[PDB]
Design a protein around this ligand. Sequence first.
Ligand SMILES: COC1=C(OC)C(=O)C(C/C=C(/C)CC/C=C(\C)CC/C=C(\C)CC/C=C(\C)CC/C=C(/C)CC/C=C(\C)CC/C=C(\C)CC/C=C(/C)CC/C=C(\C)CCC=C(C)C)=C(C)C1=O
Ligand SMILES: COC1=C(OC)C(=O)C(C/C=C(\C)CC/C=C(/C)CC/C=C(\C)CC/C=C(\C)CC/C=C(/C)CC/C=C(\C)CC/C=C(/C)CC/C=C(\C)CC/C=C(\C)CCC=C(C)C)=C(C)C1=O
Ligand SMILES: COC1=C(OC)C(=O)C(C/C=C(\C)CC/C=C(/C)CC/C=C(\C)CC/C=C(\C)CC/C=C(\C)CC/C=C(\C)CC/C=C(\C)CC/C=C(\C)CC/C=C(\C)CCC=C(C)C)=C(C)C1=O
Ligand code: HEC
Ligand code: HEM
Ligand code: HEM
Ligand code: HEM
Ligand code: HEM
Ligand code: FES
Ligand code: FES
Lengths: 164, 45, 62, 81, 241, 54, 379, 379
Amino acid sequence: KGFSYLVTGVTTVGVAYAAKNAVTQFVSSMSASADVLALAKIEIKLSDIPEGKNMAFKWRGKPLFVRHRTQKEIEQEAAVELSQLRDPQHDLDRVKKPEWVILIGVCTHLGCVPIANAGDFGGYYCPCHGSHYDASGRIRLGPAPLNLEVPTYEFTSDDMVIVG
Amino acid sequence: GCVPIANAGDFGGYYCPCHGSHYDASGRIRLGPAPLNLEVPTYEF
Amino acid sequence: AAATLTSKLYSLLFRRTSTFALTIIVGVMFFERAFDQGADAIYDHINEGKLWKHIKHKYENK
Amino acid sequence: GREFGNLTRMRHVISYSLSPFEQRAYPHVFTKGIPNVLRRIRESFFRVVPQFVVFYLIYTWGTEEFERSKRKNPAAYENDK
Amino acid sequence: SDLELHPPSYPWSHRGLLSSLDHTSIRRGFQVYKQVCASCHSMDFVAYRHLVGVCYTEDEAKELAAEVEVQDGPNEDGEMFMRPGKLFDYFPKPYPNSEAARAANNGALPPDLSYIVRARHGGEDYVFSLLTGYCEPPTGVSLREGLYFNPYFPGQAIAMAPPIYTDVLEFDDGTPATMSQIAKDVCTFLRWASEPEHDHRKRMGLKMLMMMALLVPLVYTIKRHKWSVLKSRKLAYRPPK
Amino acid sequence: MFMRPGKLFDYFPKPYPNSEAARAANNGALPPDLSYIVRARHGGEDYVFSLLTG
Amino acid sequence: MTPMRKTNPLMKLINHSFIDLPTPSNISAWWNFGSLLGACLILQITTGLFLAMHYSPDASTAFSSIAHITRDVNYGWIIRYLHANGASMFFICLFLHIGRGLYYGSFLYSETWNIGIILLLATMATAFMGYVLPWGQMSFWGATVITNLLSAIPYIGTDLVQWIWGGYSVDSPTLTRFFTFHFILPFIIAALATLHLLFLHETGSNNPLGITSHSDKITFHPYYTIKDALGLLLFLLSLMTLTLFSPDLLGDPDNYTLANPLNTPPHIKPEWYFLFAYTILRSVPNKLGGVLALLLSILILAMIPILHMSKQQSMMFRPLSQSLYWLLAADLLILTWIGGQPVSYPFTIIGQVASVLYFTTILILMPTISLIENKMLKW
Amino acid sequence: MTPMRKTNPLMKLINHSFIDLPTPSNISAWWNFGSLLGACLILQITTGLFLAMHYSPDASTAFSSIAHITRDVNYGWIIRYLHANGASMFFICLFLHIGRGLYYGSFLYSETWNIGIILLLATMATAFMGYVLPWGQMSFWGATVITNLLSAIPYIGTDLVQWIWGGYSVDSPTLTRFFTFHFILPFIIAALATLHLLFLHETGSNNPLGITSHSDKITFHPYYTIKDALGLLLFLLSLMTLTLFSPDLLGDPDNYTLANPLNTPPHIKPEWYFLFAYTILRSVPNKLGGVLALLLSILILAMIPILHMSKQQSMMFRPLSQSLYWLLAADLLILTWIGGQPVSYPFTIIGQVASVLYFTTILILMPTISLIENKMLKW
Ligand SMILES: COC1=C(OC)C(=O)C(C/C=C(/C)CC/C=C(\C)CC/C=C(\C)CC/C=C(\C)CC/C=C(/C)CC/C=C(\C)CC/C=C(\C)CC/C=C(/C)CC/C=C(\C)CCC=C(C)C)=C(C)C1=O
Ligand SMILES: COC1=C(OC)C(=O)C(C/C=C(\C)CC/C=C(/C)CC/C=C(\C)CC/C=C(\C)CC/C=C(/C)CC/C=C(\C)CC/C=C(/C)CC/C=C(\C)CC/C=C(\C)CCC=C(C)C)=C(C)C1=O
Ligand SMILES: COC1=C(OC)C(=O)C(C/C=C(\C)CC/C=C(/C)CC/C=C(\C)CC/C=C(\C)CC/C=C(\C)CC/C=C(\C)CC/C=C(\C)CC/C=C(\C)CC/C=C(\C)CCC=C(C)C)=C(C)C1=O
Ligand code: HEC
Ligand code: HEM
Ligand code: HEM
Ligand code: HEM
Ligand code: HEM
Ligand code: FES
Ligand code: FES
């Protein structure tokens, strides 16, 4: 009996092996095409951006703002209150380097594009209703339930920042 | 599929620059490797 | 006079179907790694130099 | 008529069988198996093979004649001069 | 006119059932394509990626893509501009439209090379023989001034001028440049461009063969085991007398 | 690419090539396409009429 | 206490059809293709469903969509090749499934035999509309030729062609409707297959000998499950070998070039499984004659049961009928081979001889020899 | 010679299923909504099939193709509105189908009641994916919200949301993938609908009184075929009035604008048939807790047979249970109304109260009142 059942036992092993492989193929086809990955997460960016300047970029179809900002602008951020927000968030808990700020380039009120280096806070200015924002973009004048989106970014080299 | 040339051809018809094949105004096979005559759905003028 | 290998394999494992299934799946876990590695090594040994992973040395790390 | 309980009416028949575990899965597969296959092949060789041979002959000739046609004609150029 | 001359079967390094593609040949084949081919032929279905794991490393591919210039989407409150190019842009097309290409090539339209190998009979064997064998017309045939004789073309008349001769390029590898050498490399590169799953396909085939070898005898054994009871059955007939 | 005089099968000309040019010439505001404006806005043409008169 | 598979309604059906189905014990491999056909269908369905998630049924992006599947979609190339190669396997099993009935006399099961004819026509339509989806040179022009074949209708003609095309020629609207029809028909074939099995169960399967098997019936669960599980393993072995070693062997180039309404390739031959009928068409100069021939061909299968004259089912015991059968098979091979060759003198005459021989053998020779064999047996 | 409808295999099933199965004589019009549902299913297939002959599932050409169908394609507008409005009629019949079971105790048929729950879940999936096909402003954001609400799953959520998307957003691959699922799913529903009937047929239909009707059964054909025909005529009347006079009342405008990814509309709301659930999740403060509530709810329908503790099947003779049933119906109406209103203090508290009232009614109040009613009758 042991011999015969061994044959059966071995056979199932083979059937199992292929089974898993086959399924992993069909499921993997639904994950994401190579082009999707190529177009996404590819957001290497130089650190040469001067202080206060805001060079516009594109990311997942969303315009993206990367700004180096002078120390006095960061002092102006301290003037604005992080407890005066619908979703409070401590300053350094938002930006890993206060002199660096990476944020989305679309306002949450009507999809309008804020004007860089403008507004009463020295941050962003939406002409659609004259809405004002700070360098950090804290929701101040608008229906936005929480603050402006903090995109996920990771520093790998001192000169590049991955954003994906 | 090469476009016949306007006011061309050795017999006043058409001239094909691709291979020098000549066609009459009516498109009949007169010269060239073309298997059949020029295909026009309707000879309506 | 020693009891045959198959007889021991039967009484301890194959007699109970639940253990029979358990040994099958563990064997799959192990055989998958072994079979995959062996086949890959054979394929590479058939085509030394052609595969780009053997070419990285001539140009790498700038 | 569609249930094993009632299909036909048989009588005076006996059958003998052995368990799968009491017999070999490949018994006399060297002395008694091969010759039986050879009997099977030989018994139906002339009923099938020869026709498909005719097909092969028709296929070869065809191809040969087709190519033979594309060869240039020396009798169409002897007088062309 | 006359039956086209069938190319011969050449000993490619991947003709074997389990062989693969020499990836150094693909590297040099692409190098040929970058300037000699791209003048008027195009590869619509290839990007500067697909090469990271095949021939070139990440950084070298990015540097190579920087050497080209593409046209980008409309600038906000502006118009189109020119972008350097990243590892998601397909290879530049030589002409905006087919009609413009025909005008610059005496009315002939250079086909896209992405699927040329699988498109023509003989595959790379046909291309190799085509690239070579640019002889003069035999006695009794004439050709238009902008056409060239080639016995492997189905019409024997082709608008392609001989594109490859010796010393046209200089490989960085140091391999001498020879018409035969360049043809071999570019044909290999094209065979890849029409089948980049070649190596993976054959690896899976190898595993399939070994798995079947183990399985088929096993499953047949189980079938014989279960059926033995029927194959050995013996019958007897004992009427009342 | 040459310019034809225009035929029946042609659609109505686009005032601008892209949305960016439209907004640039309209002080940032993008004038929506009118092909479905009536069935898009709440209130139907009642909204449009009062919008123009007021 | 009694078994639970004899009470639950959903288990009664499975018990009847699968577990306790009385089946003859001496059935050979020929009786396996039936199961394989369904298995292949189940494969195609799933394979196609995954291809539909990335296919654009438009005349301007269909070809580019496939190129994107095979170069960017994870394991897209294998899925596409499995679908293409799995279609040829379908026909191979289908032709062998029909040949068995012709040889062993299974056509005597009128109901089941007629349902099969319908299933064959439905599958033929599914494969034709699938082959036009890629939108290659062969795809575009093959549809044009086959669709222009309805102009031979006496008085309607053009109306049907323009109606099917949704226009004056073959273009995007034709592609879209074909995509939908391609998607739906396979599921209709599944329903027909259930009707096929339905009428079959009332009588049971026919043994190779042709004698009643009621004395030697056995259950299906332990024996034919493993026997049909071994056949499916062989079927997969053949299919995977074709896909993983010769992905493009049973196909044809020029499907990898974009369709051009102006240019036309010379040979423009259709798919191998639609070649024997193609030669029959070209053998008759008239268009109406050819279309009638094509139809009369399939109709013969319906008339075969009426042409039977022997007093036995199987041809195993009738060697003269066996020889005629194999000659008919060889004639079909010649028809297929001719379909693959250009129009020329030797091929044209050979095709005509093959076509007339085909029809005459079925309509004349088979009944005559059957009566002759009845005479030598003193029936 | 006996009738052929009792001998032919295909005719036996038709005779059993339609012509001659005994039915209670007293079943009211409530028992007519089951046949209508299938009819609507049939209607929803054909119309959608024709729409599929012209629709292009791509992020860019999807909206354009719908406009092309409505204007250029012959009778395209009427087909689209029949499809759109038939969906709403399907859900109205579906809710009435479920309501009848809860009131008259049909849930006691466990096997049949459980299959029904699956049909409901499948139906909702088909409807949700179909609403994405127009690719309007509401469709894009509706899918975005109802999909991002799987990131709450303990550890796999984020992994199983990008996989559904085919990417890190909602784009064309989602659209094509949903298109295939939309096509295929309804046919599975059709197959399941045959299991529903099958399990029903082995016991017989219920009657309003709740007493077995073996004493007064009637052949289905003459009486109920005409009765169901009358119901179908009335159903068509309602559908044509909706489409031919006020096609867009039940839809939500702003779906006629091209989907803008970087523009969140002020007021996102699901379709009218899904609103009741939306308010049950928007009320729970925890994101994961809201998903657990939307699921625990739908499944209490599966728990109804357990909570049943009355000694009478039908609520006709249970006046207090009737009051609760209408109260629960009113609660569902409140949930629907709140679903369409913006977030604010009054609606939020009303929604919270409605949710708790909904659940506590099904769980505690109904069993307790049934026990009291049993005590009253001195069982
Ligand atoms: C406000 O935004 C929102 C909306 O608006 C916009 C919404 O629309 C929705 C609603 C969600 C909508 C689309 C999305 C949800 C989709 C799903 C849950 C389902 C996911 C799946 C789908 C596409 C695939 C659907 C699956 C299909 C076809 C597979 C089924 C296939 C088959 C043949 C069926 C076969 C079944 C067979 C053999 C089993 C046979 C038996 C049975 C029924 C018998 C029952 C057996 C049992 C044990 C149960 C009996 C139990 C007993 C006694 C115990 C009592 C039970 C208790 C629980 C107490 C949400 C959530 C939302 O947020
Ligand atoms: C109260 O009491 C009751 C009960 O309780 C006693 C009951 O139980 C029931 C029964 C319950 C019900 C109905 C409820 C639902 C339950 C059911 C079992 C049924 C479940 C439903 C289904 C599977 C769905 C059925 C089908 C539907 C919508 C149809 C879809 C499928 C199709 C075939 C339909 C047809 C589509 C067609 C033809 C297309 C239209 C196009 C046509 C002309 C053009 C077509 C052209 C072509 C194919 C061209 C092809 C060309 C080709 C190859 C080219 C050839 C060229 C050459 C040259 C040869 C009831 C009613 C009841 O009241
Ligand atoms: C020889 O002797 C024999 C006989 O004679 C004696 C016989 O007679 C028989 C009899 C048997 C036969 C021949 C057998 C075959 C018989 C037949 C009639 C043939 C029948 C074939 C069929 C039905 C075909 C079967 C296959 C089919 C339809 C396809 C199956 C697959 C699918 C539908 C897809 C399944 C899922 C897949 C790949 C997974 C991928 C997708 C996903 C996870 C889904 C993604 C998500 C979504 C839809 C979203 C849903 C949720 C949404 C939007 C939101 C949820 C909520 C949120 C909040 C997010 C045999 C065997 C025999 O041998
Ligand atoms: C650099 C090596 C090279 C390769 C490999 C190559 N081309 Fe072409 N090619 C053409 C044109 C025009 C055609 C179409 C007819 C012809 O060959 O003249 C063509 C045709 C072809 C064909 C076969 C066409 C057919 O229908 O079979 C191949 C293969 C090909 N090109 C590949 C212009 C060019 C030009 C522009 C001067 C260059 C450079 C060129 N070709 C160089 C190359
Ligand atoms: C196209 C898909 C088809 C499927 C899925 C299918 C399915 C099946 C299956 C599973 C069997 C049982 C096999 C057996 O018991 O031998 C069978 C038997 C049969 N099939 Fe089909 N079949 C198809 C096509 C056809 C065709 C085209 C014909 C043409 C005549 C046909 C005629 C028959 C006959 C006559 C039988 C009975 C054989 C016997 O009783 O021995 N089938 N079919
Ligand atoms: C018996 C059933 C079927 C048969 C015989 C069949 C056959 C075919 C064939 C021969 C092709 C062309 C292959 C090629 O050109 O290489 C094809 C294409 C296709 N079929 Fe089917 N098919 C079937 C079922 C289905 C189903 C159920 C679907 C559901 C989505 C489907 C979807 C497709 C798609 C998307 C293509 C495009 C192929 C491509 O893009 O390369 N098929 N089919
Ligand atoms: C979705 C498509 C459905 C179809 C086509 C369908 C069809 C039918 C039909 C024709 C009947 C018998 C006639 C009638 O009751 O009017 C019936 C009865 C029944 N249905 Fe459905 N049904 C569906 C969904 C559901 C759902 C979602 C439920 C949920 C509870 C359900 C539960 C029941 C029950 C319990 C019965 C038994 C009626 C009785 O015994 O009197 N069904 N169904
Ligand atoms: C019970 C079955 C079905 C239901 C409940 C259903 C439901 C829906 C709904 C609600 C829409 C949204 C339409 C709109 O808002 O304008 C839709 C769209 C659509 N469905 Fe159906 N559907 C069903 C069956 C089918 C089938 C079988 C097909 C194709 C074979 C199909 C194809 C389509 C198409 C092409 C659209 C796009 C129409 C548009 O954008 O207006 N549907 N479906
Ligand atoms: S656009 Fe920002 S508040 Fe109006
Ligand atoms: S292009 Fe017309 S004859 Fe060659």
